[PDB]
Design a binder for this molecule. Structure first.
Ligand SMILES: *[C@@H]1O[C@H](CO[C@@H]2O[C@@H](C)[C@@H](O)[C@@H](O)[C@@H]2O)[C@@H](O[C@@H]2O[C@H](CO)[C@@H](O[C@@H]3O[C@H](CO[C@H]4O[C@H](CO)[C@@H](O)[C@H](O)[C@@H]4O)[C@@H](O)[C@H](O[C@H]4O[C@H](CO)[C@@H](O)[C@H](O)[C@@H]4O)[C@@H]3O)[C@H](O)[C@H]2NC(C)=O)[C@H](O)[C@H]1NC(C)=O
Ligand SMILES: *[C@@H]1O[C@H](CO)[C@@H](O[C@@H]2O[C@H](CO)[C@@H](O)[C@H](O)[C@H]2NC(C)=O)[C@H](O)[C@H]1NC(C)=O
Ligand SMILES: *[C@@H]1O[C@H](CO)[C@@H](O[C@@H]2O[C@H](CO)[C@@H](O)[C@H](O)[C@H]2NC(C)=O)[C@H](O)[C@H]1NC(C)=O
Ligand SMILES: *[C@@H]1O[C@H](CO)[C@@H](O)[C@H](O)[C@H]1NC(C)=O
Ligand SMILES: N[C@@H](Cc1ccc(O)cc1O)C(=O)O
Ligand SMILES: [Zn+2]
Ligand SMILES: [Zn+2]
Ligand SMILES: [Zn+2]
Ligand SMILES: [Zn+2]
Length: 447
């Protein structure tokens, strides 16, 4: 989750993650591109405000007041610069001066030409096989991060797409208990609470940026899946897109799709929750997908209706107390899918984003594994298009987004876990076209 440069004994010892940009005069002489004016090494801001109660709750979780368990100094960039060392630009800008506005367009995957479709799944496949040039992932919790001999950082290289999967797993994993310790309350830094929409927003942005980097195609954009069709099939589960059903195992992907070759990460909950370890970069086992195949829950075998999207955009409040999966008249809880499309919570309703996950009846539905099915990307670009439309209709009314007593990870000014450099929910609560340099090509149901 941290730059390779910072995953060292010395940098953890200093508490400082301020890598060089262009260290012409030797190591440490252009931290954060300070010698060119691009940024400065400064103290991290981290939300201190209180969260909703948990029984029991030790507070030993390395995700509290993120990222302070590891670093308390990052790069703060000036102007429209950003990046872990301020070597790149804020979203929406390009150039060595970061002064050319760029605007990329995210579109319906089904609207793409045959050429762009092939480019997408090949780009996706590439990002699955290519080492992240920048981030490395911890395989051990903080108290063991430096190894048995105390001089060996427990960090692994990981692929671009697997990093996208890893960050999601880390945000939902259970707090370790140990030996003799009671069952700690279950927590979720990226679902069941207001930060769900902004966490996943940044999640996508980080993948888009990493893939534009990988391809050296600055305008590359992530497309989206309109799952609000009422359909009883998955209309992008074809061999020229996300993969059709295997004729040999009806829960596998057709061997004629590259995605049948993908192998998953983070599928060892039993190992982690007992050995005390974290998901690592070693893959094991294929994607399972079985659209409409959940015969035990008939509600989970059709997709959301088109009016479900239009109706949830009528919920005027962004979120409501207790800012949880049981909130009512809360647009966040509606689009996430724990309340019905009108606003009304019911513990039996599964709608929209949650409905779309369960529909897949496979790897795409398990909360710790779901990004391993690449349909995750396009399910979430769609969800984010709904978020972006809401932000527009209601001029980004951030007021009902709680500053405190939200579930842990979800306070308005929390640094979304485990993204780097630190980045608050507030920074994602903006219309995308003007403030984040992307927009959606989408028409909304007009009822
Ligand atoms: C920002 O981070 C700085 C770096 O700290 C690391 O990174 C952060 C993000 C965390 O991961 C942190 O745990 C990492 O260590 C941080 O500076 C560091 O602050 C710590 C905590 O105070 C310092 O450790 C303490 O040092 C004192 C005094 O130094 C003694 O040096 C020798 C060595 O033994 C002694 O013989 C002398 O008596 C010196 O006086 C120790 O008294 C103290 O030990 C006691 O406390 C610890 C827990 O803190 C217990 O385990 C012990 O048993 C003792 O009860 C600490 O070890 C550390 O030196 C310091 N490092 C540097 C490089 O400055 C900084 O404070 C953070 N800034 C902010 C604003 O929060
Ligand atoms: C996919 O759906 C199937 C069938 O709808 C699920 O397996 C059933 O789960 C129920 C409830 O837990 C069990 O009592 C049944 O024994 C299971 N049926 C069969 C035929 O195995 C399955 O868990 C779903 N998988 C995912 C990943 O969503
Ligand atoms: C939503 O779920 C929360 C969290 O479980 C519920 O809060 C509980 O409320 C009861 C009585 O009000 C307390 O005894 C529990 O300790 C609370 N749990 C926690 C974790 O704090 C709440 O009841 C639900 N809210 C609604 C509106 O139904
Ligand atoms: C990580 O990758 C970089 C280049 O991508 C390489 O220089 C380095 O040796 C790799 N690190 C490890 C720990 O294998
Ligand atoms: N109700 C489901 C919906 C869901 C949400 C997110 C996810 O990654 C996978 C999912 O399957 C759950 O909380 O497990
Ligand atoms: Zn706490
Ligand atoms: Zn600054
Ligand atoms: Zn998620
Ligand atoms: Zn999701």
């Amino acid at each position: 989750q941290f730059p390779r440069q910072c995953a060292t004994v010395e940098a953890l010892r200093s508490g400082m993650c301020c890598p060089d940009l262009s260290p012409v005069s030797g190591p440490g002489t252009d931290r954060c591109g300070s010698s060119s004016g691009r940024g400065r090494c400064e103290a991290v801001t981290a939300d201190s405000r209180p969260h909703s109660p948990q029984y029991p709750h030790d507070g030993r979780d390395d995700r509290e007041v993120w990222p302070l368990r590891f670093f308390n100094r990052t790069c703060h960039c000036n102007g429209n610069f950003s990046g872990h060392n301020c070597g790149t630009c804020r979203p929406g800008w390009r150039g060595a001066a970061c002064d050319q506005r760029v605007l990329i367009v995210r579109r319906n995957l089904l609207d793409l030409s045959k050429e762009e479709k092939n480019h997408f799944v090949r780009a996706l496949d590439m990002a699955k096989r290519t080492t992240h040039p920048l981030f490395v992932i911890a395989t051990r919790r903080s108290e063991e991060i430096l190894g048995p001999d105390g001089n060996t950082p427990q960090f692994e290289n990981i692929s671009i797409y697997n990093y996208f999967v890893w960050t999601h797993y880390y945000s939902v994993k259970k707090t370790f208990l140990g030996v003799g310790q009671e069952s700690f309350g279950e927590v979720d830094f990226s679902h069941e609470g207001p930060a769900f929409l902004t966490w996943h927003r940044y999640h996508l942005l980080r993948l888009e940026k990493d893939m534009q980097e990988m391809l050296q195609e600055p305008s590359f954009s992530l497309p989206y899946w309109n799952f609000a069709t009422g359909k009883n099939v998955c209309d992008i589960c074809t061999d020229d897109l996300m993969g059709s059903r295997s004729n040999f195992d009806s829960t596998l992907i057709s061997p004629n799709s590259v995605f049948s070759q993908w192998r998953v990460v983070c599928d060892s909950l039993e190992d982690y929750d007992t050995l005390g370890t974290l998901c690592n970069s070693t893959e094991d086992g294929p994607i399972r997908r079985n659209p409409a195949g959940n015969v035990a829950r008939p509600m989970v075998q059709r997709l959301p209706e088109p009016q479900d999207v239009a109706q949830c955009l009528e919920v005027g409040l962004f979120d409501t107390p207790p800012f949880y999966s049981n909130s009512t008249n809360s647009f966040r809880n509606t689009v996430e899918g724990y309340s019905d499309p009108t606003g009304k919570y019911d513990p039996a309703v599964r709608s929209l984003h949650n409905l779309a996950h369960l529909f897949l009846n496979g790897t795409g539905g398990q909360t710790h594994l779901s990004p391993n099915d690449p349909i995750f990307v396009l399910l979430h670009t769609f969800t984010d298009a709904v978020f972006d439309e809401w932000l527009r209709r209601y001029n980004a009314d951030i007021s009902t987004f709680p500053l405190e007593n939200a579930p842990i990870g979800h306070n308005r000014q929390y640094n979304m876990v485990p993204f780097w450099p630190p980045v608050t929910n507030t920074e994602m609560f903006v219309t995308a076209p003007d403030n984040l340099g992307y927009t959606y090509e989408i028409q909304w149901p007009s009822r």
